């Protein structure tokens, strides 16, 4: 209900699912390849949103 | 006086390995039947060459086999721009006369070659070197002039340019030397006495753990509880490092009508 | 040596010579032609010529080197791997000792100093 | 991309896998840059050996005959 | 807890080593297949063993 009643909840999950690189990383994680992430890696979806033209702050 | 056999004959022990790359049932069944009767078959062809008999290449059904040419984006249009992409298809489509012409050398690599100087020009160079090592440089003026006279001018241009190339290559090799022999900040004052008694295998996966969480069973017994406590500790260490952050620099490529600097691209768009 | 996963295609094109070859990225479509099951990580597919090397190992593990490896998907992987490391070795040497042959180099067409303009 | 096998070996691709994220993965590429300059320098220090060991001098006057290959037109 | 093995880390002090484990552990996301778990994932369950490409016995033979 919290996901459905939210406004940006649909956008955060859609932009992550539409980012091909984030899905390639997720495909490797399911196969057994995982590691720690830097601050720049944790924003890989925020960079993808900015490139499309969204106004995302806190990069 | 038996004919010589190549090394490949001792791998297969026969001159008639019916190798067909086409992986269909009809082809491989006929190849197995033809492979067994090849000793008494009049319609038999060799695929292993010998000193006395040439051979055929790999078969593809009734035609012949050759690998797909390495992807090459170079092409030439005839009627309309096709926007040929060598990575968009598995097998390269055939070139139609009105559509495209591909780059030359379907099966070709990049090498460096050299022309061979004329034989008389070589004989004058050998005579100068021999007279030089025997009599010295100062008594070879006659042999030095024979080179400039007998060697054609295109050879003298090649000889002049070889010296400039090897002079360029000499400086490029020495600049790599200076970068290689440079003492870094993490190796200041360290000598061969400070090297650890280890070999290449001591840096592999069995001895040095990779930088991934599932490389081995190190973190297989970690529960959610220990994860939450670890998050509290990594955030506690960030209470001292977040105080520093680089300042935003100027965009050197702000002007669009200016040749932009090939700056390092961002990790993510 | 290329120290990254990606390279500018124009930096390996000649400026004063006809461009008859390119240095393309790995052909990921050939990876889908392998019929058997195998594990491949996306973190290894962009570095030059290595995908074709891993495809060759997967094919030489499933099949051998005799009468089973001789299929179109496996022979193209070995041919691409051999051709890729040959072209990259030649382009690497040409980039090291003939950097002025390529587009983007400041010596392909040198800009003169202001002292040569006579102003 | 020269010194392919050397760079692949230094990155550890012969025994392990690269980090799945571009940040650390791209730093690992730039880490071998010093070692490639060292290994390339070592390979250019080989001493010379007589060239007339496995190869006859092609500029010798003995080979001025320019002999052709006699064949049988079967 | 952290399990020790033949493959060792590359840190001089123990504080650097423990800091590396804390950084790696804080990034672990458990994906269990059993219901009634705080970390439950029927699909998109991650493996906990990394695959390594090696020449098999048929390869070297
Ligand atoms: C034309 C009209 C007519 C035909 C209609 C046909 C409709 C079909 C078309 C599809 C519609 C689009 C919606 C697809 C949703 C994606 C679902 C999916 O892939 O599963 C993943 C999904 C999540 O996986 P997970 O295990 O939770 O991930 C854990 C990881 O830790 C996760 O963490 P991580 O770090 O590993 O990250 C992994 C990454 C992976 O990223 C990806 O792979 C991309 C995934 C694509 C989704 C991203 C866009 C999401 C957009 C949100 C808005 C969607 C609204 C729905 C649209 C409906 C349109 C009307 O991220 C995700 O996991 C993505 C989150 C996916 C959540 C999906 C949102 C929930 C839907 C809400 C409504 C639920 C309705 C269900 C009703 C069922 C009734 C039987 O799995 C499930 O949901 C399991 C099902 C629910 C369990 C209850 C048991 C139900 C059993 C039902 C059996 C019968 C099935 C239906 C039979 C029908 C015939 C009778």
XYZ file of C-alpha atoms and ligand atoms in Angstrom:
682
model
C 0.000 0.000 0.000
C 2.867 2.388 0.749
C 4.371 1.620 -2.661
C 1.036 2.095 -4.430
C 0.091 5.272 -2.558
C 3.454 6.877 -3.303
C 4.241 9.170 -6.210
C 7.983 8.668 -6.737
C 7.877 4.982 -5.775
C 6.774 4.132 -9.309
C 9.561 6.247 -10.816
C 12.416 4.980 -8.645
C 11.655 1.355 -9.503
C 10.955 2.032 -13.181
C 14.173 3.978 -13.744
C 16.149 1.214 -12.034
C 14.481 -1.521 -14.079
C 15.005 0.437 -17.297
C 18.716 1.044 -16.648
C 20.394 -1.744 -18.604
C 23.677 -1.552 -16.692
C 22.005 -1.822 -13.290
C 20.219 -4.925 -14.567
C 23.489 -6.360 -15.866
C 25.018 -5.821 -12.433
C 21.965 -7.407 -10.819
C 22.265 -10.357 -13.194
C 25.864 -10.861 -12.055
C 24.839 -10.655 -8.399
C 22.332 -13.469 -8.882
C 25.074 -15.550 -10.504
C 27.357 -15.052 -7.486
C 29.421 -11.933 -8.297
C 28.899 -9.262 -5.654
C 31.042 -6.786 -3.754
C 30.901 -3.516 -1.873
C 29.781 -0.283 -3.508
C 31.331 3.163 -3.350
C 29.312 6.353 -3.039
C 29.554 6.828 -6.801
C 28.194 3.338 -7.474
C 25.205 3.889 -5.180
C 24.149 6.833 -7.374
C 24.294 4.967 -10.693
C 20.520 5.316 -10.969
C 20.628 9.007 -10.055
C 23.072 9.644 -12.890
C 20.768 7.736 -15.245
C 17.852 9.935 -14.175
C 19.803 13.160 -14.645
C 20.898 12.105 -18.130
C 17.251 11.662 -19.101
C 16.564 15.176 -17.796
C 15.104 14.551 -14.337
C 15.903 16.977 -11.520
C 17.667 14.769 -8.971
C 19.776 16.443 -6.293
C 22.246 14.897 -3.886
C 24.527 13.334 -6.498
C 61.228 -43.110 -51.115
C 57.989 -42.777 -49.182
C 56.283 -39.363 -49.375
C 56.606 -37.154 -46.339
C 53.639 -36.745 -44.013
C 52.815 -33.630 -42.007
C 52.328 -33.672 -38.245
C 48.548 -33.515 -38.636
C 48.584 -36.973 -40.224
C 49.825 -38.442 -36.946
C 46.992 -36.745 -35.050
C 44.262 -38.306 -37.190
C 46.178 -41.316 -38.579
C 44.258 -40.939 -41.853
C 44.142 -38.749 -44.935
C 40.317 -38.868 -45.086
C 38.782 -37.241 -42.013
C 35.360 -36.311 -43.368
C 35.094 -33.066 -41.436
C 31.916 -31.139 -42.208
C 31.036 -28.079 -40.164
C 27.327 -28.143 -41.035
C 25.680 -29.678 -37.966
C 22.618 -31.260 -39.507
C 21.656 -34.904 -39.233
C 21.892 -35.624 -42.954
C 25.392 -34.165 -43.222
C 26.957 -35.845 -40.188
C 25.418 -39.239 -40.962
C 26.718 -39.160 -44.528
C 30.092 -37.991 -43.218
C 30.283 -40.948 -40.838
C 29.364 -43.410 -43.573
C 31.813 -41.842 -46.021
C 34.481 -41.783 -43.315
C 34.290 -45.558 -42.859
C 34.401 -46.486 -46.562
C 37.031 -43.900 -47.512
C 39.630 -46.656 -47.854
C 37.693 -48.365 -50.664
C 35.646 -45.411 -51.932
C 36.441 -44.037 -55.408
C 34.603 -40.792 -54.567
C 36.960 -39.988 -51.689
C 38.795 -36.701 -51.209
C 41.624 -35.901 -48.826
C 41.439 -33.204 -46.186
C 44.933 -33.833 -44.774
C 47.702 -32.659 -47.135
C 50.827 -34.669 -47.847
C 54.038 -34.273 -49.815
C 52.603 -36.188 -52.779
C 48.963 -35.065 -52.718
C 47.256 -31.779 -51.993
C 44.077 -31.645 -49.939
C 40.806 -29.795 -49.523
C 39.730 -27.518 -46.712
C 36.851 -27.905 -44.318
C 33.572 -28.844 -45.962
C 30.244 -27.065 -45.430
C 27.553 -29.361 -46.744
C 28.258 -29.527 -50.455
C 30.120 -26.195 -50.461
C 33.253 -25.170 -48.544
C 33.729 -23.633 -45.109
C 35.439 -20.420 -44.053
C 34.932 -18.593 -40.743
C 32.896 -15.436 -40.515
C 35.219 -12.517 -41.309
C 36.210 -10.455 -38.311
C 33.781 -7.545 -37.807
C 34.766 -4.547 -39.924
C 32.571 -1.463 -39.982
C 34.094 -0.175 -43.214
C 31.716 -0.393 -46.158
C 30.742 1.498 -49.290
C 27.164 2.286 -50.263
C 25.745 2.151 -53.778
C 22.101 3.303 -53.753
C 21.308 4.417 -50.204
C 23.094 4.577 -46.839
C 22.590 1.174 -45.224
C 24.198 2.037 -41.859
C 25.978 -1.301 -41.830
C 26.652 -2.665 -38.350
C 28.915 -5.744 -38.258
C 27.751 -6.500 -34.707
C 24.028 -6.539 -35.509
C 24.100 -9.951 -37.208
C 25.869 -13.238 -36.579
C 26.791 -14.163 -40.157
C 27.738 -11.344 -42.504
C 25.081 -10.985 -45.185
C 26.296 -11.238 -48.752
C 27.114 -8.047 -50.622
C 24.603 -7.127 -53.303
C 25.734 -4.963 -56.202
C 23.162 -2.233 -55.551
C 23.400 -2.270 -51.746
C 26.944 -2.406 -50.361
C 30.589 -3.279 -50.918
C 32.585 -4.412 -47.918
C 36.145 -3.527 -47.052
C 38.911 -5.553 -48.703
C 40.550 -8.486 -47.009
C 37.770 -10.625 -45.592
C 40.560 -12.627 -43.923
C 43.413 -10.200 -43.331
C 45.483 -8.794 -40.490
C 47.634 -5.724 -39.932
C 51.381 -6.256 -40.285
C 54.449 -4.133 -40.915
C 56.511 -4.838 -44.027
C 59.570 -3.414 -45.737
C 60.768 -3.184 -49.304
C 64.063 -4.835 -50.178
C 66.739 -2.425 -51.346
C 68.229 -3.138 -54.778
C 71.041 -5.663 -54.905
C 73.642 -3.190 -56.256
C 72.676 -0.702 -53.556
C 73.180 -3.425 -50.945
C 76.609 -4.365 -52.305
C 77.802 -0.772 -51.949
C 76.555 -0.653 -48.351
C 78.416 -3.865 -47.524
C 81.576 -2.510 -49.159
C 81.379 0.681 -47.097
C 80.851 -1.181 -43.827
C 83.700 -3.582 -44.550
C 86.022 -0.767 -45.590
C 84.916 1.131 -42.492
C 85.668 -1.619 -39.973
C 89.029 -2.324 -41.643
C 90.348 1.123 -42.577
C 88.192 3.496 -40.530
C 85.536 6.048 -41.377
C 87.864 8.765 -42.676
C 89.192 6.561 -45.516
C 85.821 5.528 -47.004
C 84.959 8.643 -49.015
C 85.075 6.718 -52.293
C 82.721 4.035 -50.992
C 80.422 6.652 -49.464
C 80.038 8.383 -52.832
C 79.312 5.098 -54.602
C 76.297 4.694 -52.320
C 74.922 8.129 -53.167
C 75.471 7.492 -56.880
C 74.486 3.865 -57.422
C 71.622 3.596 -54.954
C 68.501 5.094 -56.562
C 67.036 8.182 -54.948
C 64.038 6.333 -53.521
C 66.450 4.074 -51.645
C 68.312 7.080 -50.235
C 64.974 8.477 -49.055
C 64.192 5.185 -47.316
C 67.645 5.060 -45.730
C 67.221 8.634 -44.503
C 63.773 7.902 -43.061
C 64.793 4.690 -41.284
C 67.248 6.735 -39.224
C 64.507 9.176 -38.262
C 62.109 6.382 -37.308
C 64.593 4.513 -35.121
C 65.496 7.858 -33.565
C 61.810 8.315 -32.775
C 61.497 4.747 -31.491
C 64.634 5.221 -29.400
C 63.131 8.177 -27.554
C 59.822 6.367 -27.083
C 61.573 3.367 -25.535
C 63.598 5.612 -23.210
C 60.555 7.588 -22.067
C 58.965 4.290 -21.068
C 62.222 3.506 -19.265
C 62.073 6.757 -17.301
C 58.467 6.133 -16.273
C 59.260 2.534 -15.365
C 62.406 3.322 -13.378
C 60.701 6.186 -11.548
C 60.560 5.754 -7.780
C 56.989 6.154 -6.570
C 55.935 7.674 -3.259
C 54.959 4.275 -1.835
C 58.388 2.771 -2.666
C 60.632 5.528 -1.285
C 63.663 4.007 0.421
C 62.661 0.414 -0.350
C 65.205 -1.967 -1.864
C 65.418 -5.641 -2.809
C 65.983 -6.432 0.870
C 62.415 -5.354 1.691
C 60.786 -7.686 -0.848
C 58.636 -10.480 0.529
C 59.738 -14.047 -0.300
C 56.733 -14.752 -2.523
C 56.063 -15.923 -6.072
C 53.270 -15.419 -8.577
C 51.095 -18.124 -7.010
C 51.070 -16.283 -3.678
C 48.948 -13.549 -5.258
C 46.347 -15.877 -6.766
C 42.905 -16.861 -5.498
C 44.092 -19.718 -3.282
C 46.407 -17.498 -1.216
C 45.153 -13.928 -1.728
C 41.407 -13.541 -1.422
C 39.776 -11.585 -4.265
C 37.829 -8.409 -3.559
C 34.408 -10.052 -3.819
C 32.102 -11.226 -1.056
C 31.437 -14.725 -2.447
C 34.937 -15.602 -3.635
C 35.088 -18.126 -0.786
C 33.075 -19.083 2.313
C 34.321 -16.174 4.440
C 30.951 -14.419 4.838
C 28.647 -17.433 4.501
C 27.841 -17.506 8.243
C 26.881 -13.821 8.501
C 23.357 -13.101 9.724
C 21.177 -10.021 9.436
C 21.956 -9.061 13.036
C 25.691 -8.769 12.401
C 24.966 -6.800 9.228
C 22.987 -4.164 11.131
C 25.794 -3.781 13.666
C 28.327 -3.463 10.844
C 26.298 -0.656 9.269
C 26.447 1.222 12.571
C 30.244 0.915 12.545
C 30.824 2.008 8.948
C 28.602 5.031 9.554
C 30.551 5.814 12.723
C 33.796 5.933 10.744
C 32.121 8.344 8.316
C 31.770 10.828 11.185
C 35.384 11.828 10.440
C 35.842 11.486 6.655
C 32.782 13.357 5.352
C 34.430 16.607 6.513
C 36.452 16.702 3.261
C 35.063 16.977 -0.272
C 36.607 18.451 -3.452
C 35.323 21.807 -4.661
C 33.319 22.033 -7.877
C 35.699 22.975 -10.686
C 35.005 24.983 -13.829
C 33.621 23.243 -16.910
C 36.366 23.513 -19.525
C 33.890 22.403 -22.222
C 31.269 25.048 -21.459
C 31.549 26.640 -24.913
C 29.855 24.448 -27.520
C 31.523 26.246 -30.423
C 34.912 25.248 -29.034
C 36.877 22.044 -29.524
C 36.128 20.136 -26.303
C 38.785 18.433 -24.229
C 38.692 14.646 -24.372
C 38.091 14.493 -20.630
C 37.504 11.255 -18.757
C 33.883 10.213 -19.080
C 31.669 9.751 -16.057
C 31.239 6.232 -14.736
C 27.468 6.585 -15.070
C 25.316 8.816 -17.336
C 47.768 -1.240 -24.058
C 44.182 -0.089 -23.566
C 43.612 0.484 -19.838
C 39.810 0.569 -20.017
C 36.761 -1.337 -21.207
C 35.865 1.235 -23.863
C 37.887 3.146 -26.431
C 37.039 5.907 -28.871
C 36.558 4.355 -32.292
C 37.915 7.471 -33.997
C 41.195 7.322 -32.071
C 42.107 4.109 -33.915
C 41.237 5.449 -37.372
C 43.958 6.841 -39.613
C 43.995 10.522 -40.512
C 46.360 10.551 -43.515
C 45.528 7.080 -44.858
C 42.454 5.299 -46.125
C 40.428 3.631 -43.380
C 39.879 0.023 -44.429
C 39.555 -1.527 -40.954
C 38.094 -0.541 -37.603
C 38.743 -1.778 -34.089
C 35.221 -2.823 -33.093
C 34.003 -3.736 -29.639
C 33.324 -7.352 -28.719
C 30.533 -9.001 -30.721
C 28.159 -9.880 -27.894
C 25.721 -11.501 -30.319
C 28.090 -14.414 -30.857
C 27.732 -15.245 -27.165
C 24.092 -16.224 -27.720
C 24.942 -18.772 -30.420
C 26.405 -21.211 -27.895
C 23.846 -23.973 -27.455
C 25.044 -25.315 -24.108
C 24.658 -23.781 -20.666
C 27.440 -21.627 -19.255
C 27.984 -18.852 -16.726
C 29.198 -15.479 -17.979
C 29.405 -12.227 -16.046
C 28.683 -8.927 -17.758
C 31.780 -7.442 -16.111
C 34.087 -9.371 -18.464
C 32.442 -8.807 -21.848
C 33.679 -5.311 -22.720
C 37.431 -5.679 -22.263
C 39.036 -6.227 -25.634
C 39.301 -9.741 -27.070
C 38.621 -11.434 -23.713
C 35.021 -12.426 -24.434
C 36.182 -14.448 -27.434
C 38.811 -16.054 -25.206
C 36.240 -17.100 -22.602
C 33.911 -18.378 -25.320
C 36.743 -20.553 -26.623
C 37.344 -22.019 -23.158
C 33.643 -22.736 -22.696
C 33.544 -24.461 -26.082
C 36.725 -26.439 -25.394
C 35.307 -27.551 -22.033
C 31.928 -28.669 -23.359
C 33.439 -30.250 -26.450
C 37.037 -31.259 -26.975
C 39.304 -30.464 -29.908
C 38.292 -33.353 -32.199
C 35.144 -33.688 -34.313
C 32.956 -32.012 -31.685
C 34.604 -28.603 -31.392
C 34.314 -28.325 -35.189
C 31.003 -26.488 -35.316
C 30.365 -22.975 -36.644
C 29.772 -21.355 -33.253
C 33.004 -22.680 -31.735
C 35.336 -22.124 -34.697
C 34.237 -18.497 -35.091
C 34.983 -17.917 -31.409
C 38.517 -19.256 -31.762
C 39.068 -17.398 -35.032
C 37.804 -14.130 -33.545
C 40.020 -14.539 -30.483
C 43.124 -15.174 -32.574
C 42.310 -12.339 -34.976
C 41.429 -9.913 -32.183
C 44.711 -10.315 -30.300
C 46.628 -9.987 -33.573
C 44.909 -6.759 -34.626
C 45.190 -5.271 -31.143
C 48.884 -6.128 -30.955
C 49.450 -4.364 -34.275
C 47.296 -1.363 -33.358
C 48.993 -1.227 -29.968
C 52.460 -1.015 -31.486
C 51.245 1.476 -34.077
C 49.724 3.555 -31.280
C 53.030 3.464 -29.402
C 55.520 4.151 -32.194
C 53.256 5.832 -34.779
C 50.832 7.941 -32.734
C 50.760 10.585 -35.472
C 48.889 8.239 -37.826
C 45.618 8.432 -35.899
C 42.797 10.935 -35.640
C 42.950 12.987 -32.464
C 46.716 13.068 -32.155
C 48.228 16.572 -31.929
C 51.021 15.487 -34.296
C 48.817 14.170 -37.113
C 48.489 17.776 -38.301
C 50.666 19.905 -36.005
C 49.472 23.388 -35.109
C 52.370 25.858 -35.443
C 53.787 27.992 -32.689
C 52.917 31.670 -32.802
C 56.578 32.503 -33.481
C 56.306 30.867 -36.917
C 53.449 33.100 -38.118
C 55.556 36.253 -38.471
C 53.231 38.675 -36.683
C 45.518 -3.147 -26.847
C 48.992 -4.676 -26.930
C 50.386 -6.869 -24.154
C 46.968 -8.493 -23.953
C 47.948 -11.692 -22.144
C 50.192 -9.742 -19.777
C 47.443 -7.286 -18.850
C 44.837 -10.040 -18.490
C 47.202 -11.932 -16.199
C 48.001 -8.896 -14.051
C 44.300 -8.120 -13.601
C 43.809 -11.629 -12.207
C 41.413 -12.864 -14.883
C 43.270 -16.189 -14.975
C 42.121 -17.122 -11.457
C 39.396 -14.724 -10.274
C 36.766 -12.280 -11.507
C 36.769 -8.508 -11.725
C 34.667 -6.414 -9.348
C 31.114 -6.085 -10.692
C 31.048 -2.275 -10.334
C 32.670 0.136 -12.767
C 34.397 2.238 -10.104
C 36.760 -0.383 -8.697
C 36.879 -2.264 -11.997
C 38.181 0.775 -13.877
C 40.700 1.560 -11.137
C 42.069 -1.971 -11.467
C 42.760 -1.322 -15.151
C 44.861 1.768 -14.420
C 46.762 -0.093 -11.686
C 48.838 -2.192 -14.108
C 49.970 0.828 -16.127
C 53.262 0.998 -14.232
C 53.881 -2.735 -14.591
C 53.337 -2.731 -18.356
C 55.973 -0.018 -18.708
C 58.341 -2.181 -16.652
C 57.705 -5.476 -18.436
C 57.972 -3.830 -21.845
C 61.308 -2.296 -20.851
C 62.666 -5.665 -19.723
C 61.869 -7.306 -23.060
C 64.041 -4.715 -24.841
C 67.282 -5.632 -23.048
C 68.013 -8.902 -24.815
C 71.640 -9.278 -25.911
C 72.460 -9.978 -29.555
C 73.305 -13.385 -30.979
C 74.857 -14.206 -34.380
C 72.297 -13.644 -37.124
C 74.055 -16.315 -39.208
C 72.875 -19.045 -36.843
C 69.601 -20.287 -38.339
C 69.571 -18.060 -41.428
C 71.993 -17.801 -44.323
C 72.823 -14.247 -45.288
C 70.516 -13.479 -48.241
C 72.891 -10.773 -49.510
C 75.659 -13.296 -50.142
C 76.905 -13.310 -53.762
C 76.282 -17.058 -53.884
C 72.550 -16.343 -54.202
C 72.926 -14.058 -57.228
C 72.111 -17.001 -59.497
C 68.393 -16.209 -59.150
C 67.635 -19.841 -59.892
C 64.040 -20.807 -60.599
C 62.108 -23.856 -59.431
C 62.149 -26.638 -62.060
C 58.717 -28.259 -62.231
C 56.982 -31.102 -64.040
C 53.913 -29.992 -65.987
C 51.839 -33.058 -65.182
C 30.734 -14.494 12.165
C 33.659 -14.193 9.759
C 35.108 -17.562 8.768
C 38.838 -17.898 8.153
C 40.332 -19.864 5.287
C 43.363 -20.436 3.089
C 42.837 -17.201 1.142
C 44.011 -14.369 3.386
C 43.533 -10.619 3.167
C 46.188 -8.012 2.344
C 46.168 -5.630 5.315
C 48.989 -4.865 7.723
C 46.999 -4.079 10.874
C 43.878 -5.701 12.279
C 41.925 -2.433 12.320
C 42.322 -2.148 8.549
C 41.231 -5.768 8.160
C 38.217 -5.392 10.446
C 37.273 -2.198 8.614
C 37.285 -4.095 5.319
C 35.022 -6.817 6.699
C 32.618 -4.214 8.075
C 32.477 -2.527 4.672
C 31.811 -5.838 2.925
C 29.301 -7.092 5.490
C 27.328 -3.842 5.447
C 26.762 -4.454 1.718
C 25.498 -8.026 2.097
C 21.840 -8.512 1.186
C 20.465 -11.864 2.307
C 18.042 -13.585 -0.071
C 16.374 -16.630 1.484
C 13.956 -19.062 -0.151
C 11.950 -19.893 2.987
C 8.759 -18.078 3.906
C 8.359 -16.237 7.217
C 11.827 -14.699 6.829
C 12.701 -11.015 6.960
C 14.790 -11.590 3.806
C 12.545 -13.681 1.551
C 12.881 -13.804 -2.239
C 11.104 -16.458 -4.325
C 12.604 -15.083 -7.510
C 15.809 -13.047 -7.791
C 17.600 -15.106 -5.158
C 21.337 -14.514 -5.230
C 23.938 -17.255 -5.139
C 26.600 -17.192 -2.434
C 29.393 -18.904 -4.399
C 31.294 -17.191 -7.194
C 31.876 -19.104 -10.422
C 35.387 -19.405 -11.839
C 36.210 -20.260 -15.446
C 38.905 -22.937 -15.483
C 40.220 -25.395 -18.087
C 38.472 -28.677 -17.394
C 39.994 -32.150 -17.482
C 38.731 -32.698 -21.021
C 40.382 -29.396 -21.924
C 43.873 -30.318 -20.744
C 43.663 -33.950 -21.879
C -2.982 -7.264 -21.797
C -3.851 -7.414 -20.550
C -4.196 -8.888 -20.336
C -2.972 -9.730 -19.958
C -2.370 -9.293 -18.621
C -0.981 -9.907 -18.461
C -0.212 -9.209 -17.339
C 1.240 -9.693 -17.344
C 2.216 -8.620 -17.837
C 3.139 -8.210 -16.686
C 2.602 -6.970 -15.958
C 3.765 -6.071 -15.526
C 4.056 -6.314 -14.042
C 5.255 -7.249 -13.896
C 5.773 -7.206 -12.463
C 7.101 -7.955 -12.366
C 6.834 -9.295 -11.679
C 8.107 -10.135 -11.597
O 8.873 -10.159 -12.499
O 8.345 -10.881 -10.437
C 9.250 -10.288 -9.554
C 8.631 -10.243 -8.161
C 9.633 -9.657 -7.180
O 10.684 -10.546 -6.934
P 11.286 -10.592 -5.401
O 11.496 -12.021 -4.977
O 10.316 -9.933 -4.451
O 12.717 -9.783 -5.372
C 13.457 -9.868 -4.200
C 14.782 -9.140 -4.348
O 15.328 -8.966 -3.079
C 14.594 -7.777 -4.991
O 15.733 -6.993 -4.767
P 16.958 -6.947 -5.871
O 18.092 -6.134 -5.306
O 17.449 -8.342 -6.170
O 16.424 -6.233 -7.256
C 15.907 -7.032 -8.283
C 15.342 -6.102 -9.351
C 14.864 -6.892 -10.573
O 14.466 -6.001 -11.579
C 13.695 -6.571 -12.604
O 13.872 -7.694 -12.930
C 12.622 -5.727 -13.294
C 11.232 -6.168 -12.843
C 10.163 -5.456 -13.673
C 9.240 -4.656 -12.751
C 9.747 -3.218 -12.644
C 8.625 -2.226 -12.932
C 7.688 -2.180 -11.732
C 6.578 -1.159 -11.968
C 5.706 -1.088 -10.718
C 4.245 -0.909 -11.114
C 3.665 -2.245 -11.566
C 2.153 -2.245 -11.358
C 1.554 -3.513 -11.965
C 1.145 -3.258 -13.418
C -0.102 -4.074 -13.757
C -0.818 -3.463 -14.959
C -2.327 -3.587 -14.768
O 14.313 -5.367 -8.747
C 13.080 -6.014 -8.590
O 12.989 -7.034 -7.996
C 11.838 -5.368 -9.179
C 10.703 -5.386 -8.162
C 9.536 -6.183 -8.736
C 8.258 -5.883 -7.955
C 7.052 -5.903 -8.893
C 5.966 -4.945 -8.401
C 4.866 -5.721 -7.675
C 3.561 -5.714 -8.475
C 2.415 -5.094 -7.666
C 1.068 -5.739 -8.015
C 1.047 -7.237 -7.695
C -0.029 -7.943 -8.514
C 0.184 -9.453 -8.433
C -1.150 -10.175 -8.593
C -0.888 -11.659 -8.844
C -2.201 -12.437 -8.786
C -1.933 -13.913 -9.071
O 8.262 -11.526 -7.741
C 6.961 -11.632 -7.230
O 6.249 -10.687 -7.160
C 6.433 -12.977 -6.750
C 4.911 -12.975 -6.888
C 4.253 -12.500 -5.594
C 4.396 -13.559 -4.501
C 3.012 -14.037 -4.058
C 2.673 -15.358 -4.742
C 1.778 -15.082 -5.947
C 1.783 -16.289 -6.882
C 0.978 -15.960 -8.135
C 1.118 -17.086 -9.158
C 0.298 -16.754 -10.403
C 1.081 -15.787 -11.290
C 0.160 -15.091 -12.293
C -0.649 -16.090 -13.121
C -1.578 -15.320 -14.060
C -2.546 -16.258 -14.784
C -3.476 -16.952 -13.790
